[PDB]
Design an enzyme around this catalytic site. Structure first.
Site, PDB file in Angstrom:
ATOM      1  N   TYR A   1      -1.577   3.391  -4.759  1.00 21.09           N
ATOM      2  CA  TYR A   1      -1.262   2.568  -3.597  1.00 21.09           C
ATOM      3  C   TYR A   1      -2.077   3.312  -2.519  1.00 21.09           C
ATOM      4  CZ  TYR A   1       1.632   0.953   0.438  1.00 21.09           C
ATOM      5  OH  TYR A   1       2.109   0.437   1.619  1.00 21.09           O
TER       6      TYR A   1
ATOM      7  N   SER B   1      -3.686  -4.752  -3.827  1.00 20.16           N
ATOM      8  CA  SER B   1      -3.526  -4.728  -2.357  1.00 20.16           C
ATOM      9  C   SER B   1      -4.240  -3.505  -1.752  1.00 20.16           C
ATOM     10  CB  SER B   1      -2.029  -4.761  -1.986  1.00 20.16           C
ATOM     11  OG  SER B   1      -1.312  -5.822  -2.602  1.00 20.16           O
ATOM     12  N   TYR B   2      -3.538  -2.627  -0.970  1.00 19.38           N
ATOM     13  CA  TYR B   2      -4.191  -1.419  -0.461  1.00 19.38           C
ATOM     14  C   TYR B   2      -4.659  -0.567  -1.653  1.00 19.38           C
ATOM     15  CZ  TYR B   2      -5.333   2.157   2.964  1.00 19.38           C
ATOM     16  OH  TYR B   2      -5.985   3.024   3.803  1.00 19.38           O
TER      17      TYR B   2
ATOM     18  N   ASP C   1      -4.540 -16.894  -1.856  1.00 21.49           N
ATOM     19  CA  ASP C   1      -3.965 -15.723  -1.204  1.00 21.49           C
ATOM     20  C   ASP C   1      -4.052 -15.883   0.320  1.00 21.49           C
ATOM     21  OD1 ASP C   1      -3.243 -13.098  -0.384  1.00 21.49           O
ATOM     22  OD2 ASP C   1      -4.122 -12.218  -2.209  1.00 21.49           O
TER      23      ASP C   1
ATOM     24  N   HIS D   1      -0.865 -13.791  -3.017  1.00 22.76           N
ATOM     25  CA  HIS D   1      -0.979 -12.344  -3.152  1.00 22.76           C
ATOM     26  C   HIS D   1      -0.122 -11.769  -4.288  1.00 22.76           C
ATOM     27  CE1 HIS D   1      -2.766  -8.763  -1.708  1.00 22.76           C
ATOM     28  NE2 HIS D   1      -1.612  -8.144  -1.447  1.00 22.76           N
TER      29      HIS D   1
END
Ligand SMILES: *[C@@H]1O[C@H](CO)[C@@H](O[C@@H]2O[C@H](CO)[C@@H](O[C@H]3O[C@H](CO[C@H]4O[C@H](CO)[C@@H](O)[C@H](O)[C@@H]4O)[C@@H](O)[C@H](O[C@H]4O[C@H](CO)[C@@H](O)[C@H](O)[C@@H]4O)[C@@H]3O)[C@H](O)[C@H]2NC(C)=O)[C@H](O)[C@H]1NC(C)=O
Ligand SMILES: N#Cc1c(N2CCC[C@H](N)C2)n(Cc2ccccc2)c2c(=O)n(Cc3ccnc4ccccc34)cnc12
Ligand SMILES: N#Cc1c(N2CCC[C@H](N)C2)n(Cc2ccccc2)c2c(=O)n(Cc3ccnc4ccccc34)cnc12
Ligand SMILES: *[C@@H]1O[C@H](CO)[C@@H](O)[C@H](O)[C@H]1NC(C)=O
Ligand SMILES: *[C@@H]1O[C@H](CO)[C@@H](O)[C@H](O)[C@H]1NC(C)=O
Ligand SMILES: *[C@@H]1O[C@H](CO)[C@@H](O)[C@H](O)[C@H]1NC(C)=O
Ligand SMILES: *[C@@H]1O[C@H](CO)[C@@H](O)[C@H](O)[C@H]1NC(C)=O
Ligand SMILES: *[C@@H]1O[C@H](CO)[C@@H](O)[C@H](O)[C@H]1NC(C)=O
Ligand SMILES: *[C@@H]1O[C@H](CO)[C@@H](O)[C@H](O)[C@H]1NC(C)=O
Ligand SMILES: *[C@@H]1O[C@H](CO)[C@@H](O)[C@H](O)[C@H]1NC(C)=O
Ligand SMILES: *[C@@H]1O[C@H](CO)[C@@H](O)[C@H](O)[C@H]1NC(C)=O
Ligand SMILES: *[C@@H]1O[C@H](CO)[C@@H](O)[C@H](O)[C@H]1NC(C)=O
Ligand SMILES: *[C@@H]1O[C@H](CO)[C@@H](O)[C@H](O)[C@H]1NC(C)=O
Ligand SMILES: *[C@@H]1O[C@H](CO)[C@@H](O)[C@H](O)[C@H]1NC(C)=O
Ligand SMILES: *[C@@H]1O[C@H](CO)[C@@H](O)[C@H](O)[C@H]1NC(C)=O
Lengths: 727, 733
Positions: free
Chosen positions: A508, A591-592, A669, A701
């Site tokens: 992450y 994501s990140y 998304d 997402h």
């Protein structure tokens, strides 16, 4: 024995049991069992039927959820649920009178309702429909329309717009009832000048022309929504005249430029606190506003205004913290970063500007959970100096030395990560242990912190798992520059330290992230370790949370730097263990984590053979203003444009010739736009780098529809298995 | 020796030389040599410098193209070229005065001009800018504005809209000058009610918010553009008053419902012919219109109408054929399907309904190339009964049995596929041989068909290829139900019929396709055969062209049926050949070939291990009206909705569990919308079928930018090599 397979993960063969209760008083809770709702006495554990599972047999619609009024007189039945964004949705609602056994058939809550809530006492209702607020004093009576300015995609009354839902309130609601329900406070967002993100939506195959979805979404540096705040007295509404909403304006220190409303907290029946944050998120102001009975207005005295500022980063973990007011509303407790950069509880008197820290140490308070007349209850990671553990503590309000750990020693080998749910006035609490052993739910009395009974111990799951070769979890740390950096490893069953295993780094690594913890999870990593014999590791480097600001603020104005470098260093610290095959180290994230995976793959480190980025950010100018600017400032030459341009995945494209990469993104998304992966692929094509891709039509997402979820994990499993030469 | 590698294909290491000439008269042509424009005398082969290369460097910008006025007094210089669709683009233009040796800087053609053309004689210009037509009588003089109704995405004057560009005219131009330039005819399209296709365009990474591109595009059964036709006299334009355009309306047999303008051909200085086609494309009408000096209007005599209809399919190969008028304009020659379903040349008198066929046989005329007072010149595939061959013939207009083949025997081993370029009055002709050997360009004189000289023989390429292990090509046929169906195979070098090779079926298979021919090509298949030892085969089955209507119309109202089944049958026939490894048969195609590949992979045949579909059609309701409805009719319950619903790729999703599939599509495809592959992938996900995918950001139907082209072929080569168990090779970076 059998292993925990991919089908086990995808079909949820091995289910974790929960014990979701709803407190209704200081001594009783409701618990849904076999579709019937029971009421339990917390002291003795006896129960009675509150609402039978047969009551609504003839309803005619599938019920999604329910909400019982605080006085127990009515039940709201939610159906026709239609998801919008992470939190938002619309639904239809019916009200059932529990004493009369009647459904309300006139003056009903409309279909396509955006938000509905009971008042905190009694049975008033506030709801939002077509972006306007309505109040019903009684379920059988007509609604009073509070606002008339609501307009799709432009004016939002009592509900958030996209960015406030995702990044500020973590909710679609922007309504706050006063404690006894007299007043209804609400925010109004104006997205008139906010640019629209536009993307295609293909729909069912019968749709001949794709639809273009258009959402007001401010990307970094773009025009943001503006906000206003109002309070209406619901006890003085008229059927003859329109409702008067009193505006509470932001302080002049906020009105000077762009700003946000970031917290709304009622202190008493006549006092409300509002926190405001500058668009440059290192300065925040809390106003404490009192109702003036003589003028009908709300006044925020500067004598009760509190400033919070950060010199090393932004304010708060993700936003300024919530205040917890004493019953009289004259003092409050709030988590604040201390002089050493550790987040601890501070005690404030409303008219005194210097707070007093009531906790201290090289550990942090995670949240304030309950405030009674005598004790404050909080969760921290103090125990054993493990940042990835969580335990409940209490502190005596008159003597800060009188601290008791309430959960540390209950079951220390099984339980190191707790959350809690207190009764209405905190006479009882449910402890929810989520690891490292199987989750355990217990009930306690706060009178002298004595255990009452076990509610759910997951013995059924324990019996099923005795027949399965399950992986284990190791939590430890490495020392870099005299600082501990924690990691976890999901280890294959019958783990042998002399043997070499392939390793997957699950990342992450965003600001305030924590991927090394004591939580028990059954997920894709469980399958990879159990069936495929892959070590699944995660590491918390610079930028990670719950360890103080020297670590968390290390990436201030500098995303895509130290947190990326630290994942590579972790894999170097692992790849040399005699149990890690240095020729088979992979990295993945969503994501990140997709951004960090891509930045790591593009680093030229030579550590990683392959990696998977799912819905990654690729360039900070494409992501939303509130999150991005919190860490990056503005993408202007005067501010931080140079680092925005230096921290893109696209600039690293040539280095992807060294790795095998799989890039995945849902076409619908609304959060990390497909644009971000479309720019990565274009950059890789422009430098002649071969890679693997997968789009997911009409997925957002989450890529969370049943079929898409199974397909993505099946596709990624084939990719990792080919990378690691697993049959 | 070395092999023909993927890098050789991608970097164009082995270049085919051409000889592109432009006839300027009946005895001279222009030819570009070392950036200079040379004028050549056809009779002697001597040249003179017409325009020195250096002139092109005095502008400060790179010149994309040029066009010399027919009188040779001016040169139109095209620059700032910006591509739109297949044919359309905008550009800036400068005119250079060759007599004054100076650039014209006054009354310039505007930037963002959509189309420009010289008149066919002299030096008048007509151009389209902001969807309106302008005419310049002299290059340095103010333009006359012809139309004032042009409006982006709504009214198009003198240029086509999306569907007319792609499907009807194969051009962005909708301007037709009369032979001596007196009149300018033009079409006007009205897209007011045509729905828009919308898709994202990401642009350079600096663009913070993607752009939504919106194009009026009628999908099958949707509202189509409407059309009007006009003629303006350019010799009577005024600087004081607006120009009078004379409308020519469609015949009422067309006005009863939706229709198209499908051909515009000038017959004489004062006679124009137009062909109109009904939206149900099996009925067309040709109108012959004469200028009336007494009214200043155009009269289309009802007695001069010619109807062309089809009872077995649609009219024409892709549209009704063009007429070729005799000098007096009182008669014309046109390719028409005969009673046996073979396309042959028919002779018509303008006032007579029945035509006379001048050619016949179980072969077809491809095109009419030139018409003189004594001869008609045409290309056909008659020679050796090979539908994939092409030769030039001439026929005496006074005796139809007097047919001479002009190209058949020039070099029968090297040359079996010809095209031709005649001089202004057909005194000379250039023959362009494109295979089976290296392309050969030669010049001839028509009087006695004397060979004058070899213009380009590709000897430089021949020298390079002598050192390369090149593949060979086999062109042959298989018999199915007493009908010959042709196929070709690109065979690896040192081909050994005793070994078992993997086979890739390269498919098009759309209506009137022809993938089995005598053309020499250097393409991806050359690398697959030369370097990877893969046989690359193609097959022309039912629905294929140039072999008569019995074969071509077999798929009428039934796309996704016989042409799909025939590719599976061809592979079965190939797989039984002892030289094919039946465990390593793949199929691939782009566009219609992508649709067929996907339909074959979803058939459950068990024949194919894997396949690749590039920018495929997946459901006919997603493709454009003109092409789709030509073959499928309308997607209505009363017409052909059941077959539109039965011929989708999505309905076959469950069968993809048996095969390895790679699906590829450009995100900015304006032609086969990305939507088509987005629905295939969604259907595969919904049934739990794993597959491989690749999108190409901002690429269109061609996936033709230098980097995307290299990337797609590299990605597809790894996919095929893995499917076929072929080894990989490391490279330094
Ligand atoms: C879990 O178990 C608890 C223990 O039984 C339950 O609590 C009990 O609830 C009942 C109902 O509310 C209470 O009932 C009556 O209490 C008094 C008498 O109390 C005395 O006797 C009780 C035994 O019968 C003892 O339990 C008490 O300690 C005490 O010595 C009566 O005067 C009441 O009468 C009034 O109310 C009833 C209606 O409820 C009327 O019908 C009467 O006319 C009158 O108006 C009650 O009958 C009982 O006191 C209480 N016991 C406790 C708390 O110790 C608990 O409800 C249950 N919880 C669940 C969720 O199931
Ligand atoms: N909760 C939460 C999270 C969060 N945000 C909280 C504040 C609001 C912000 N919009 C989103 N992001 C950060 C983020 C930044 C930018 C774009 C999107 C999200 C992340 C993230 O990234 N991961 C990581 C993460 C998310 C989901 N699955 C994963 C599987 C493996 C590895 C990592 C995973 C995990 N959780 C969150
Ligand atoms: N010229 C031409 C072509 C054509 N059209 C002519 C009339 C106008 C129509 N819009 C496009 N289509 C048919 C088509 C139908 C539907 C959608 C798009 C295109 C095809 C086609 O399909 N392929 C096949 C083809 C095209 C390109 N590369 C290939 C590589 C390997 C195999 C096959 C290939 C080849 N050429 C054409
Ligand atoms: C909600 O929709 C249903 C279905 O159309 C309708 O019967 C019902 O009356 C609606 N409810 C309200 C409150 O309008
Ligand atoms: C919303 O903001 C715009 C300016 O961006 C302003 O014109 C408009 O009046 C505002 N609307 C409301 C209801 O505040
Ligand atoms: C309430 O406000 C709305 C919107 O301005 C208006 O239409 C309506 O007439 C008002 N009602 C009264 C009673 O003033
Ligand atoms: C609720 O609080 C308001 C504001 O002080 C007060 O006027 C009202 O009486 C209270 N209601 C009750 C039921 O105590
Ligand atoms: C807030 O951040 C801006 C931009 O980095 C900076 O100029 C300002 O000094 C900061 N304020 C504090 C108190 O650090
Ligand atoms: C350790 O300190 C060195 C020297 O200042 C620095 O380059 C490196 O980034 C640091 N690494 C950490 C904190 O992990
Ligand atoms: C070719 O030569 C002839 C003389 O034989 C001459 O008249 C003619 O102009 C020449 N043509 C060119 C283009 O050089
Ligand atoms: C075309 O564009 C250039 C650049 O803006 C400008 O200098 C020139 O004058 C334009 N030409 C015409 C004909 O408008
Ligand atoms: C275009 O067609 C529309 C009807 O679809 C009509 O309203 C409009 O007037 C037409 N425009 C022209 C210039 O013919
Ligand atoms: C020509 O037509 C345009 C558009 O209708 C008009 O504005 C202009 O005045 C007309 N010119 C003359 C000379 O009538
Ligand atoms: C061009 O044709 C028109 C129409 O017949 C005629 O008026 C004109 O004289 C012709 N031009 C020449 C150069 O003969
Ligand atoms: C044209 O096609 C339609 C649909 O197949 C048919 O009804 C009609 O008879 C055809 N017309 C001719 C001339 O065959």
């Amino acid at each position: 024995r059998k292993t925990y397979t991919l089908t086990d993960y995808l079909k949820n063969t091995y289910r974790l049991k929960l014990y979701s209760l709803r407190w209704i008083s200081d001594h009783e809770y409701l618990y849904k069992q076999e579709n019937n709702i029971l009421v339990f006495n917390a002291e003795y554990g006896n129960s009675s039927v509150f609402l039978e599972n047969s009551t609504f047999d003839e309803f005619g619609h599938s019920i999604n959820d329910y909400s019982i009024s605080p006085d127990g007189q009515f039940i709201l039945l939610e159906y026709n649920y239609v998801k919008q964004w992470r939190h938002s949705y619309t639904a239809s609602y019916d009200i059932y009178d529990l004493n009369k056994r009647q459904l309300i058939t006139e003056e009903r809550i409309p279909n396509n309702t955006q938000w509905v809530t009971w008042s905190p006492v009694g049975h008033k209702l506030a709801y939002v429909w077509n972006n306007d607020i309505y109040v019903k004093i009684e379920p059988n009576l007509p609604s009073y329309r509070i606002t008339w300015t609501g307009k799709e995609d432009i004016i939002y009354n009592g509900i958030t717009d996209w960015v406030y839902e995702e990044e500020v309130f973590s909710a679609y609601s922007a309504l706050w009832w006063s404690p006894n329900g007299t007043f209804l406070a609400y925010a109004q967002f104006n997205d008139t000048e906010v640019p629209l993100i536009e993307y295609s939506f293909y729909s069912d195959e019968s749709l001949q022309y794709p639809k273009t979805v258009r959402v007001p979404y401010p990307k970094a540096g773009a025009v943001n929504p503006t906000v206003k705040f109002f309070v209406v007295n619901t006890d003085s509404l008229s059927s003859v005249t329109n409702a008067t909403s009193i505006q509470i304006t932001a302080p002049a220190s906020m009105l000077i430029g762009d700003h946000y409303l970031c917290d709304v907290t009622w202190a008493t029946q006549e006092r409300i606190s509002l926190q405001w944050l500058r668009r440059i998120q290192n300065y925040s102001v809390m106003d404490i506003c009192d109702y003036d009975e003589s003028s009908g207005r709300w006044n925020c005295l500067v004598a009760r205004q509190h400033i919070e500022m950060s010199t090393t980063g932004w304010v708060g973990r993700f936003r300024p913290s919530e205040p917890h007011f004493t019953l009289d509303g004259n003092s409050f407790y709030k988590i604040i970063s201390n002089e050493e950069g550790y987040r601890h509880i501070c005690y404030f008197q409303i008219d005194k500007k210097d707070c007093t820290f009531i906790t201290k140490g090289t550990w942090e308070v995670i949240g304030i959970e309950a405030l009674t007349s005598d004790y404050l209850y909080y969760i921290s990671n103090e125990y054993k100096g493990m940042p990835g553990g969580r335990n409940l503590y209490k502190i005596q309000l008159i003597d800060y030395t009188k601290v008791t750990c309430l959960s540390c020693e209950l079951n220390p080998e099984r339980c190191q990560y707790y959350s809690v749910s207190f009764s209405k006035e905190a006479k009882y609490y449910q402890l929810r242990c989520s690891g490292p052993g199987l989750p355990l739910y217990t009930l306690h009395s706060s009178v002298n912190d004595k255990g009452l009974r076990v509610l759910e111990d997951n013995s059924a799951l324990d019996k099923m798992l005795q027949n399965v070769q399950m992986p284990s979890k190791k939590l430890d740390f490495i020392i870099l520059n005299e600082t501990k950096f924690w990691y976890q490893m999901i280890l294959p069953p019958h783990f042998d330290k002399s043997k070499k295993y392939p390793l997957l780094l699950d990342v992450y690594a965003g600001p305030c992230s924590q991927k090394a913890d004591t939580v028990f999870r059954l997920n894709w990593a469980t399958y990879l370790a159990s069936t495929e014999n892959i070590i699944v590791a995660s590491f918390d480097g610079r930028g990670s949370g719950y360890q103080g600001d020297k670590i968390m603020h290390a990436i201030n104005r500098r995303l895509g730097t130290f947190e990326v470098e630290d994942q590579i260093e972790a894999a170097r610290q692992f790849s040399k263990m005699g149990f890690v095959d240095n020729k088979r180290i992979a990295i993945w994230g969503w994501s990140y984590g997709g951004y960090v995976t891509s930045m790591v793959l593009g680093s030229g480190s030579g550590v990683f053979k392959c990696g998977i980025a799912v819905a990654p950010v690729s360039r900070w100018e494409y992501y939303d203003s509130v999150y991005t600017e919190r860490y990056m400032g503005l993408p202007t030459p005067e501010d931080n444009l140079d680092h925005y341009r230096n921290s893109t995945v696209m600039s690293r494209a040539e280095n992807f010739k060294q790795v095998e990469y799989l890039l995945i993104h849902g076409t619908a998304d609304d959060n990390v736009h497909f644009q971000q992966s479309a720019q990565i692929s274009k950059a890789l094509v422009d430098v002649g780098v071969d890679f693997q891709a997968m789009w997911y039509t009409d997925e957002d997402h989450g890529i969370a529809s049943s079929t898409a979820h199974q397909h993505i994990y099946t596709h990624m499993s084939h990719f990792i298995k080919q990378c690691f030469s697993l049959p």
